[PDB]
Write a protein that binds this ligand. Sequence first.
Ligand SMILES: NC(=[NH2+])NCCC[C@H](N)C(=O)O
Length: 240
Amino acid sequence: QSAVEAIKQKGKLVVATSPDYAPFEFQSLVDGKNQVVGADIDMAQAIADELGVKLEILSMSFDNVLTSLQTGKADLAVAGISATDERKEVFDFSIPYYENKISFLVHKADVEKYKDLTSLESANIAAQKGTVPESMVKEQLPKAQLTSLTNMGEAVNELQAGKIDAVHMDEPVALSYAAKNAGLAVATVSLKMKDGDANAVALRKNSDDLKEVVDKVIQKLKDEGTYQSYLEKAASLTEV
Ligand SMILES: NC(=[NH2+])NCCC[C@H](N)C(=O)O
């Protein structure tokens, strides 16, 4: 019943994530080898360090991250996860570690074009399966052709190929794609967003002892501006 003691005993903290989402988590050539990096990984490492155990990152597609936590394949899920009311019915969440807006990534040549929701309504929109940006499009733009894709990298590949006109995603991720790729930009139009709902670490219910440790680490990061600093450092890394 003791999450903290169980983690200490096995000597590792297992964190489920989906590394398709720079600057939160993504793949980068460190040395040498492909490695999962990003602000969420630095935070997960801080939590593991506080507990005195090794960090083990378990990579999968986003739409299976919460399920893997729920069924015991990981101790925590950290994947830029919005702490929604719906999700709070099933999981407990840490205090928020970062709060951001939600944006559309488009072609630079189309920034003047997609100025309102009516214009997006007639566009081919992509979003990630099992996500808040996906739900928002379904709710607020029901008349749009929405393509739901498992992997965010594939959504962006479809945007680059011209099969998709706009991809809905967390703003820091859109900014990163725009900053690292010539033909891309963040649209000036955005959907109405669910008040509250910041990123938080997900845990199984009745994990109060582990939640306290996670909250302590997160509060210290926010107090020192460290999570912001982690995001800025991640932005200087190249993705695979
Ligand atoms: N690693 C990822 N692909 N994360 C996607 C997160 C999307 C959104 N913030 C959500 O919780 O639904």
